[PDB]
Design a protein around this nucleic acid. Structure first.
Lengths: 165, 280, 201, 60, 170
RNA sequence: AGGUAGAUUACCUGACGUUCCCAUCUGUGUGAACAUAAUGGUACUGAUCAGGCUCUAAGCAUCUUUACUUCCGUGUUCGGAUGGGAACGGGUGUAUCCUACUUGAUAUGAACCUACC
RNA sequence: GGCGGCACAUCUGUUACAAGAUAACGCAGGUGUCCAAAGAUGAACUCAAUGAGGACAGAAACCUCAUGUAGAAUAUAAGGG
RNA sequence: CAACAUCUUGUCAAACUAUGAAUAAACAAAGAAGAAUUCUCAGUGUUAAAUACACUUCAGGAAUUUAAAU
C-alpha cells in the first residue's frame, strides 16, 4: 500500500548513474531539435524544476513544437481501454535524441545512392542497377561441402561425474 | 603504525572525476552553460562571446561560438602585435587592453565587410564617455557577449578596457558603465587611464623619489627612450593606425620531441632485466 | 516455553535480520564458531571433512550450539585439544517471529509477531560444519561428526573432501605448489605468492 | 462483514475485448499552444496566399 | 645560473592568537594588545561548538591576527629573544612549520597598567618558497610538488642558520 | 613544439620519483593610482631583475584505479510445459534465454577552431 | 459487535512481482506547521574527519599546514539532489 | 596486554549495493493521404546581413522516374 505522491517509488528510478553525478554534458543543451524528430524522455533528478512525471521515463516521443527554452514532446499514454495523446513541454535537460530510426535511415541512404546512379545510367543508356534486397529473417542455410584435409575430430560423450568438494 | 589512509582501492573504485577543464581550474562550467545556451527556437544560429584572457605578458581576445565538435574562433586579436602599430612596451596596460579590444572590433567588421557603416567613435576627446553601437539605417550592429572566465570583475579591471575598446570600435557588446575606470570620478578618469595616464604618472612620481626604484620598475622604458609624456601621444597614434589597417598579417616550425613511449618489448625487457639482477 | 521445532522449520518469508528496525532480539545461543587448535598452521592438518545439508530449511541457533558442544566434548575425548580444528559455517542471521495468544479481551487475528529466536536459512548442498585433522585422527573425527547430525533436522550427508585443510587445492596440488614457493603460511592459513605490484629490492 | 478489497483479475481480458482504441491521425495534428512567432509566421503567409487566390478568382 | 634562488626559504605568514573563554572587556583589551604588538586590527573568533565544561557558540572567544613581510620578521625576533632562541626539536611540524607560546609580553612595560591585564600569545611561523602561489591563486589552482614542499628538517636548518638558535632534543 | 577556447568527461584520476623550456605559459619584482582585504597571502594594478625550483606538458614502474578482451560458465538464475519422481521439504527431464564476482592479457588517451613557433 | 486504533484527507522507504496499476487493523516513520528570510540574485569561500604542530588547554575551547567525493550542511519524516 | 593500522578468513540484509539477467514496456521498419529527383519559387521571422535557417497542405507550380522498402 503506497502513498499517492507525485514522485513516489523513486529511490532507484531517480538515482543518478554510478559515478555519474554532477553536471551533465554540454551536448545536451547544444543539440538542435527540429519538429518531427524522435526523442526519449529521461527525467534528470539533478534538475528538479520542470521534472517530467515518472510515468514518462524511458518513453519515446516525437517533437511537435520548439519553444525558446523547452522542447514540445508528444507521447502516447494508455488509459482504461484506450490510448490518449499527451503533449508535454520539456527542457532539453530531460530529453535525449532517439536512435529508433538509425537503422532505417541507413537503408534510405543506400537506396537513394542507388537511385542517384540509375538516373545517370538511364541517361547514358546503360542498364540500371537494382535496389538493395529487403531484410529477411535468418534463412535456412544452403548445402555446404567441408574439405577433408583441414578437419579435426573431437569425440563427445557424457562426462563421468566428479565430486566438487 | 596507525595510518588510516583514505586512498585505498575502496576509495578509488567510487571516485568520480570532475570535467577535465574544470579539473585543470580553467573553466567555470556553471557559468559557461549560461553564456553558451542559444534559444532552442533559433536553430544553429551562432551565439558569439568575446573570450578575454590576460596572461602575464599578453592580452588575448577572441570571438568564439560553441559547437558540439568544439569551439570555433571567428576572429582573434592579441597584444603582442601592438608593436606593429607603434606600441612597443607595456603590452598589458589599461591602454594596451583598450588597443587590443579596439583592434578586434575593427578587424572583425573588415572580415564581414560592415566596417564602412559602423565606425564607432574615433576622436580622443570622446574616449571617456560611454558609447553603445546603434542601428544604422535598418541594419543592427554586431552583438557579442563578454566572456571573462575566472577573473574577478572589479571596478577598474582590464577585462572592461577590452570591452570598452570594442564598443568604440563599432561592435555592440552589452554592458553598463559602472565597472570602467570611472564609476567614480568622470570621463576624464576613464580617458586618462585609457591613454596610460595612470602609467604616465608613476615615473614622474618615481623619478622624484628615487633613481634606483625608477630604474628597477621601468628599466626597459629607459633603454627604449620613452618619456612619461610621450605615452599619451603614442596611444593616440596606435588608435589612428589601427582603424586603417586591422587586417591581420601573414616558414616551417622546429619541433622538439620530448620522451616518446616505451613499446611492450622494452617495457617487458626491463622487468626481466630487473628480475635477473635480483636473482641477490 | 519453547515451541516445537516443527513450527519454524520451513524457510518462509523474506529474510528478517536484526537491524535498526528489528529491536528486542534475543541473543543467539551459539557464540563460538571455531573450536580446536584454530591456530594450527595450514600444513599440520591435511585431512578435511564436511557436513553437507541436503534440505532447504531453517536451522535454529539452539541446534548449532547443541552440536558444537557435542563435537567439542567428543573430539577432546578421542583426539585431544591440538588434534583438530572444527569450524561452524552457518550463522543465525534470521529472526523468527512469534504471535502469542493468552480471556475474551483478545484480538484474535489482528496482530503481528514478536521476536522469538534466531536461525540460519540453509539451502541444498550447503556445507554446515567442516573440520580438519591429521590422518591418525580421521576415524575419530568422522565418528564425532555423525553424532552431531542427530542434533539437526532434515537429512545431512558426511562428505570427505579430496582437498587440503580448508584450501581449494587438492591434496597433491598443495604439495606441488607449496614446494614451488607459491604458498606462504600465515599461522593458520596460507597466502598466494603474488606476481603483481611493485618489484622488490 | 469484511469484504474483498480489490482485484485486477479479469481486467486485462476485459480491456482487450474492444481493444486499445488508438487515436486518429487528427489527434497528432493539433497546433494549440504552439510557438507564438511560428503561429504568427504561418498566419501571415496563409492570409497572403488566400488574398491572392480570391483576387484572381475575382478577375476571372 | 643555478636555480637555487628559486628554493630560498622565507617567512610567508606569522600568526598570533589569544584564546580566552570570556567575552567582553578582556577580549576588548586582548584585541588592543594585538593592535599595539603588530599594528593592524585583529579578527575575533567565535565558538565552533558549545561546551559546558569551558563555559562556552555565537560569542567571541579568541582574537587572532597574521602578519607578513618585514613586519612578521621583527615580531618573530621579539618573540624569540624571550625564549633566547631555544626551540625544542618537537616544536616543528611535519609540514615545515614551527611554533611556540609565551605567557608574559614585553609590550610597553614603562606605562604598564593592570587594567589592561596580562595575556599570553602563541607564535606560529609558516615558511614558504618562491612558487608556493600555485596552491593559492584563483585560476589554475594546483598542488605544490613534494620536493618543493618543506619538511621538519628543512625548517630546522633554516632556523639554525638565520637565527643561529640551537634546537634541544630533550 | 606552445598558448587560448573547448567537446569526450579517470584510457583523462592518485602516489613514487624523472625531462626540457628556444619561443609561449607559469612561477618572479613593486605598491602609485582603479581596486583589495585583519594581512599587496588572495583579488587589483604597474612591471621584466633574475629561474626551470614548483606548476603545466612529455615520458617510467610485474604501481592502486579506470577502459576494452577472453575466461569464469552455459555454472547462478529464468520463460513454457506431465495423470514426471518426493509424505514433506525442495529438486528433474524436454523445447529455450543466459548474468555477476573473480582471474589472466592489453591500453594509460582520442579529437576540433584560432594565433605563434 | 463493543472497548482499543484510524488503515477516513494525506507523504517517504519496503511488501511489490526490473513498464503502468497494485491488498491486509502488513512493517519502520511522517502532516494539519515553519520562514522579511530560511524568497530572488551577485560575489567570495569549502564542509565532517584525520595526521602533525601551538601558554594555560586536558580527549572536547582557538590558531596553522597537509590529506580530505561530501563520510558535513541543506526548518522538518524518509528517500532523492 | 589491549588499542589502532594493515593482509587474509567464515557467514549475511525487505526497508544495502558496484554489476545485473529471463520474462517485459514503449518506438522504427516509408499515409497531407505510395516514393524520389530536377528546375522554379513566395510570405513572415531568425539573422550583423543574408542566397543560411524555421514554419507555411515536405507554402505553391511544372517536368522525369516510380508501386520498393522484415
Amino acid at each position: 500500500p503506497l502513498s499517492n505522491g507525485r514522485n513516489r517509488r523513486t529511490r532507484k528510478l531517480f538515482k543518478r548513474p554510478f559515478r555519474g553525478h554532477g553536471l551533465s554534458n554540454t551536448s545536451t543543451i547544444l543539440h538542435t531539435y527540429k519538429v518531427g524528430d524522435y526523442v526519449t524522455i529521461l527525467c534528470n533528478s539533478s534538475i528538479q524544476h520542470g521534472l517530467p512525471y515518472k510515468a514518462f521515463h524511458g518513453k519515446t516521443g516525437r517533437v511537435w513544437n520548439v519553444n525558446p527554452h523547452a522542447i514540445g514532446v508528444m507521447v502516447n499514454k494508455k488509459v482504461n481501454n484506450r490510448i490518449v495523446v499527451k503533449r508535454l513541454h520539456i527542457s532539453p535537460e530531460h530529453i535525449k535524441p532517439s536512435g529508433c530510426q538509425k537503422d532505417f535511415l541507413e537503408r534510405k541512404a543506400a537506396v537513394a545512392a542507388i537511385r542517384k546512379q540509375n538516373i545517370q545510367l538511364k541517361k547514358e543508356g546503360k542498364p540500371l542497377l537494382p535496389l538493395p534486397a529487403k531484410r529477411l529473417p535468418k534463412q535456412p542455410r544452403p548445402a555446404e561441402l567441408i574439405k577433408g584435409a583441414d578437419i579435426k575430430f573431437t569425440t563427445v560423450a557424457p562426462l563421468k561425474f566428479e565430486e566438487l568438494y | 603504525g596507525f595510518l588510516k589512509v583514505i586512498k585505498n582501492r575502496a576509495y578509488f573504485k567510487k571516485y568520480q572525476t570532475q570535467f577535465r577543464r574544470r579539473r585543470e581550474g580553467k573553466t567555470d562550467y556553471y557559468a559557461r552553460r549560461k553564456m553558451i545556451f542559444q534559444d532552442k527556437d533559433k536553430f544553429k544560429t551562432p551565439k558569439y562571446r568575446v573570450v578575454v584572457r590576460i596572461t602575464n605578458k599578453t592580452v588575448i581576445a577572441q570571438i568564439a561560438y560553441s559547437e558540439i565538435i568544439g569551439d570555433k574562433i571567428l576572429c582573434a586579436a592579441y597584444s603582442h602585435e601592438l608593436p606593429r602599430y607603434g606600441v612597443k612596451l607595456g603590452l598589458t596596460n589599461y591602454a594596451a587592453a583598450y588597443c587590443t579590444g579596439l583592434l578586434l572590433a575593427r578587424r572583425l567588421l573588415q572580415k564581414l565587410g560592415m566596417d564602412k557603416q559602423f565606425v564607432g567613435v574615433s576622436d580622443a576627446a570622446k574616449l571617456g564617455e560611454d558609447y553603445t553601437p546603434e542601428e544604422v539605417d535598418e541594419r543592427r550592429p554586431f552583438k557579442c557577449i563578454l566572456d571573462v572566465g575566472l577573473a574577478r570583475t572589479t571596478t577598474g579591471s582590464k577585462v572592461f578596457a577590452v570591452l570598452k575598446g570594442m564598443c568604440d570600435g563599432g561592435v555592440y557588446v552589452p554592458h553598463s558603465a559602472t565597472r570602467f575606470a570611472g564609476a567614480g570620478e568622470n570621463e576624464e578618469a576613464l580617458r586618462s587611464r585609457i591613454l596610460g595616464g595612470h602609467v604616465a604618472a608613476y615615473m614622474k612620481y618615481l623619478s622624484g623619489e628615487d633613481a634606483d626604484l625608477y630604474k628597477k620598475q621601468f628599466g626597459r622604458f629607459i633603454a627604449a627612450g620613452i618619456a612619461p609624456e610621450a605615452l599619451e601621444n603614442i596611444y593616440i597614434e596606435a588608435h589612428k593606425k589601427i582603424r586603417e589597417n586591422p587586417a591581420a598579417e601573414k616558414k616551417e616550425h622546429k619541433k622538439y620531441p620530448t620522451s616518446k613511449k616505451l613499446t611492450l618489448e622494452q617495457r617487458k625487457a626491463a622487468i626481466q632485466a630487473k628480475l635477473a639482477k635480483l636473482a641477490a | 516455553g519453547r515451541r516445537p521445532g516443527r513450527c519454524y522449520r520451513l524457510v518462509r518469508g523474506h529474510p528478517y535480520p536484526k537491524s535498526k528496525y528489528c529491536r528486542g532480539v534475543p541473543d543467539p545461543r551459539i557464540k563460538l564458531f571455531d573450536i580446536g587448535n584454530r591456530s594450527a598452521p595450514c600444513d599440520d592438518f591435511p585431512c578435511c571433512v564436511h557436513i553437507v545439508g541436503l534440505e532447504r530449511e531453517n536451522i535454529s541457533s539452539e541446534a548449532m550450539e547443541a552440536a558444537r558442544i557435542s563435537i567439542n566434548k567428543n573430539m577432546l575425548k578421542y583426539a585431544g585439544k591440538d588434534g583438530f580444528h572444527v569450524r561452524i559455517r552457518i550463522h543465525p542471521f534470521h529472526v523468527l517471529r512469534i504471535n502469542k495468544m493468552l480471556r475474551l479481551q483478545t484480538g484474535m487475528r489482528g496482530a503481528w509477531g514478536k521476536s522469538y529466536g534466531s536461525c540460519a536459512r540453509v539451502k541444498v548442498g550447503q556445507v554446515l560444519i567442516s573440520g580438519r585433522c591429521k590422518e591418525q585422527h580421521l576415524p575419530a573425527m568422522i565418528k564425532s561428526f555423525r553424532l552431531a547430525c542427530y542434533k539437526f533436522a532434515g537429512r545431512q550427508k558426511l562428505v570427505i573432501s579430496n582437498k587440503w585443510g580448508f584450501t581449494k587445492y587438492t591434496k597433491e596440488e598443495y604439495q606441488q605448489l607449496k614446494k614451488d614457493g607459491k604458498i606462504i603460511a600465515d599461522g593458520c592459513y596460507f597466502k598466494l605468492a603474488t606476481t603483481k605490484g611493485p618489484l622488490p629490492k | 462483514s469484511k469484504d474483498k478489497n480489490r482485484s485486477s483479475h479479469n481486467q486485462s481480458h476485459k480491456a482487450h475485448r474492444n481493444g486499445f482504441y488508438k487515436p486518429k491521425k487528427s489527434a497528432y495534428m493539433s497546433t494549440k499552444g504552439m510557438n507564438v512567432q511560428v503561429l504568427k509566421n504561418t498566419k501571415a503567409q496563409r492570409k497572403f496566399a488566400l488574398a491572392k487566390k480570391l483576387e484572381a478568382k475575382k478577375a476571372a | 645560473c643555478k636555480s637555487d634562488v628559486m628554493r630560498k626559504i622565507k617567512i610567508d605568514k606569522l600568526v598570533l592568537n589569544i584564546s580566552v573563554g570570556e567575552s567582553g572587556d578582556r577580549l576588548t583589551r586582548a584585541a588592543k594588545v594585538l593592535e599595539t604588538l603588530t599594528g593592524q586590527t585583529p579578527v575575533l573568533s567565535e565558538a565552533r561548538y558549545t561546551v559546558r565544561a569551558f563555559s562556552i557558540r555565537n560569542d567571541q572567544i579568541a582574537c587572532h591576527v597574521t602578519v607578513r613581510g618585514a613586519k612578521a620578521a621583527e615580531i618573530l625576533e621579539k618573540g624569540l629573544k624571550v625564549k633566547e632562541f631555544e626551540l625544542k626539536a618537537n616544536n616543528f611540524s611535519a609540514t615545515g612549520n614551527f611554533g611556540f607560546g609565551i605567557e608574559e609580553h614585553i609590550d610597553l612595560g614603562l606605562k604598564y597598567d593592570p587594567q589592561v591585564g596580562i595575556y599570553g600569545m602563541d607564535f606560529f611561523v609558516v615558511l614558504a618558497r618562491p612558487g608556493f602561489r600555485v596552491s593559492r591563486r584563483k585560476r589554475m589552482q594546483d598542488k605544490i610538488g613534494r620536493d618543493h614542499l618543506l619538511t621538519k628538517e628543512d625548517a630546522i636548518n633554516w632556523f639554525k642558520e638565520t637565527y643561529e638558535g640551537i634546537v634541544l632534543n630533550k
